[PDB]
Amino acid sequence: GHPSPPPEKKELRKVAHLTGKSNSRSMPLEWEHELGLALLSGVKYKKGGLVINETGLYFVYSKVYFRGQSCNNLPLSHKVYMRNSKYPQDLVMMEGKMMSYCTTGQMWARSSYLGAVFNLTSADHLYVNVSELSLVNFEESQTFFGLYKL
Numbered sequence: 001g002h003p004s005p006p007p008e009k010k011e012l013r014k015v016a017h018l019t020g021k022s023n024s025r026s027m028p029l030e031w032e033h034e035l036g037l038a039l040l041s042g043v044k045y046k047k048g049g050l051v052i053n054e055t056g057l058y059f060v061y062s063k064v065y066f067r068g069q070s071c072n073n074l075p076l077s078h079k080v081y082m083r084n085s086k087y088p089q090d091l092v093m094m095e096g097k098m099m100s101y102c103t104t105g106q107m108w109a110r111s112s113y114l115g116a117v118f119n120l121t122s123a124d125h126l127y128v129n130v131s132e133l134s135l136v137n138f139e140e141s142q143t144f145f146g147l148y149k150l
């Protein structure tokens, strides 16, 4: 019911830090958003997506820790994308790709980091995609997705 005065609106900071969730087969990725190192305040989480409720500038970031037991140079993409009524098709915001990154047969590991400033609108939905779910390690310190309002 009652609106929050801009002093009380501004005490509650708009922030998300979502951490890797190993027990999901989903794409886009699902995330931990309550316990451990995770944070969620003033932004909604649903089905792997961060759902913006206040229009404005935000810094958005994601790290993915890729690893495997036997290198075959399967290409590794990592993206942050958005869906809203203007881009019901998805808009890629940030993306990186690894090809020709390990020696064949060897145990391997490599991370990808994405971060940038975006102007987001209320009801924008933000997600993380990767090319090979099985080649992601989901420890909270290794694989993560977040943002904050500027």
Ligand SMILES: [Zn+2]
Binding pocket: 002
């Ligand atoms: Zn009143």
